[PDB]
């Protein structure tokens, strides 16, 4: 190839590296957000038509994201105050990105988790809502979508499908998640999705399990990966 | 250096970057396979003349990979289930990639590690073997090898070496692992390794511990670190 | 822009790239040296004008990072033994970097963070000091500074804020943490500091919080973030 050609291949490569590197930070860096109830920096992230999908219900815009992370997320554990704060903890340590450009590089969608130690120390357990467990684990997948607006990349769709909660006392097999798949929506819910997601991609909450597909190809052999030829191998 | 010495010096360490991403995939997207009881997708991960190791024991090939991760692994834990299935958790979250590309760029070593979260929900506690703990924590450290064939990188040894298990009710501190180095070959055993480790590798398993050799190099000091200059600083 | 403006822009971005695994490196390596209870190898991290920042203490220099590792923490948790040994568990899983490289590429700061998973097994339990947890799990967030020396990324400053911890059969709403911000010198306290902070920087200890302030610029806003806009849209 022309050094031309080549030079273009190196950039649109470099360009690339780049890109994955950017999507991860968008994810590590809401974390760090979320775990101080900063709902205004999570709102930031987002693109302004993005949306928030959380227990089956979407959140759409800034309104929606600062409505899920302010006015629920943030009232219920801090009681309306930018955190960190006495005795609460709500870490939601981030991990295991696997991040897929698309060949235009104008979008991505990106796997991630999230293992949550949360709770109310004895010190401020007076402040805990009736009915929320004072200490707790908590984990969940992200299956997110992103768009590269302007050369900088931003969260379009954040989808957090919560897999399993854990009574810090008693563990995630003898915990049953009191949170349900959205069933109303705001107004008449004032912390409730703007629309519920279609019955096809409702789940049901732990112990319930659902796959969450994965947004990547198999990475080794791609759209030729077939099961059957494998499990004839399995006894 | 020339326009064409700089081009190539480019595309050599633009190609390691891509490299050291494509080999953390695999072990990102590995653990999303596990934790799903999918043993095909993990089989499909690996070099034909691939291996895998666990307990001390090497579990050679497709057939090999096939036996532990779905004969053993998935009727233990599904029923001989593709998952993820209600109640039934088991949940490997993968990190700490630090990854050694051969100077080649044909090979390649990594250490990972892992901490699982896993158990039998009292919805299902019948279906889980007496004897399995219903709820357990466990972490192990992965040394893992790598070769890239036609491009395209592929697990060649993954090395699975357990380093703790904890019963969720008790902890690391009162529990002991009651697996133990294989003693057994497939097929006498079957679910037992193609061969035992060599008696100079083969790892009791917790509360006994020994060291897991870092594949890399001191990242500061490489060979010319010495431990002993160092200590004559400690008290 | 010519060639050469193309092959000096791409080799600047490579380098970028380069250093942020570079320094990701450092801290993954690290991890994986405290969990053995290897001070010298944390030690040979470390530029020699370096410091590590402990209980809002200062420990400076090689000398600095062989007392707290070494003389501290080695002679506490293995009698003074390189580990690992039989029956101690001390995993400091490492994850969630957010690294910010200078622009003259010559030092960077980075955002990490580690969850803990400690404690001594029943068969040496005899060995713990009166006043340890036999088991327990910690967390807390690095905000670090590295330096580019002779081509090679050290660590300049290592600054761990604990932020909380949890006795394993209780919980860390349950638990208090015994250490406290340094308040006595080394060497009159043995395995003290070098310095302590400023009053400014004291930080009180979990249930006490008090924000780590982010290294990184908002990755969408940048500058242009500002909170009260967003604040407006929560109830
Ligand atoms: O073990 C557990 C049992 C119950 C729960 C409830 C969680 C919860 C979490 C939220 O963010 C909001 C909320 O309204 C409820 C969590 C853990
Ligand atoms: O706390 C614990 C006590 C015992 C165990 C046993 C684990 C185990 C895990 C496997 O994948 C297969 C198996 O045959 C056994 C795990 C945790
Ligand atoms: O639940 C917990 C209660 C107390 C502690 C104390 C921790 C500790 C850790 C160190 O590295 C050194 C030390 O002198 C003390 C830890 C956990």
């Given at each position: 190839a022309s050094s031309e050609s080549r030079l273009a291949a190196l950039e649109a490569r470099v360009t690339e590296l780049e890109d994955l590197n950017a999507i991860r930070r968008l994810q590590w860096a809401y974390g760090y957000y979320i775990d101080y109830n900063r709902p205004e920096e999570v709102a930031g992230?987002?693109?302004?038509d993005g949306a928030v999908v959380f227990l089956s219900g979407e959140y759409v815009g800034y309104e929606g994201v600062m409505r899920l992370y302010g006015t629920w997320f943030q009232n219920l554990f801090t009681?309306?105050?930018?955190?960190?704060?006495?005795?609460l903890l709500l870490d939601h340590f981030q991990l295991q990105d696997v991040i897929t450009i698309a060949p235009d590089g104008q979008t991505a969608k990106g796997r991630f988790r999230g293992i949550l130690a949360g709770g109310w120390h004895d010190d401020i357990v007076?402040?805990?809502?009736?009915?929320?467990?004072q200490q707790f684990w908590e984990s969940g997948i992200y299956e997110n979508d992103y768009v590269k607006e302007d050369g900088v990349w931003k969260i379009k769709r954040l989808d957090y499908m919560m897999q399993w909660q854990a009574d810090y006392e008693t563990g995630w097999s003898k915990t049953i998640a009191h949170?349900?798949?959205?069933a109303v929506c705001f107004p008449e819910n004032?912390?409730?999705?703007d629309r519920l997601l279609p019955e096809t991609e409702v789940r049901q909450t732990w112990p319930h399990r659902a796959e969450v597909p994965?947004?990547?190809?198999?990475?080794?052999?791609?759209?030729?990966?077939?099961?059957g030829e494998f499990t004839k191998l399995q006894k």
């Open positions: 992230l987002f693109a302004k009681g309306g105050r930018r955190g960190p704060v006495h005795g007076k402040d805990k809502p009736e009915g929320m467990p949170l349900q798949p959205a004032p912390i409730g999705p994965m947004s990547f190809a198999h990475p080794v052999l791609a759209k030729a990966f077939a099961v």
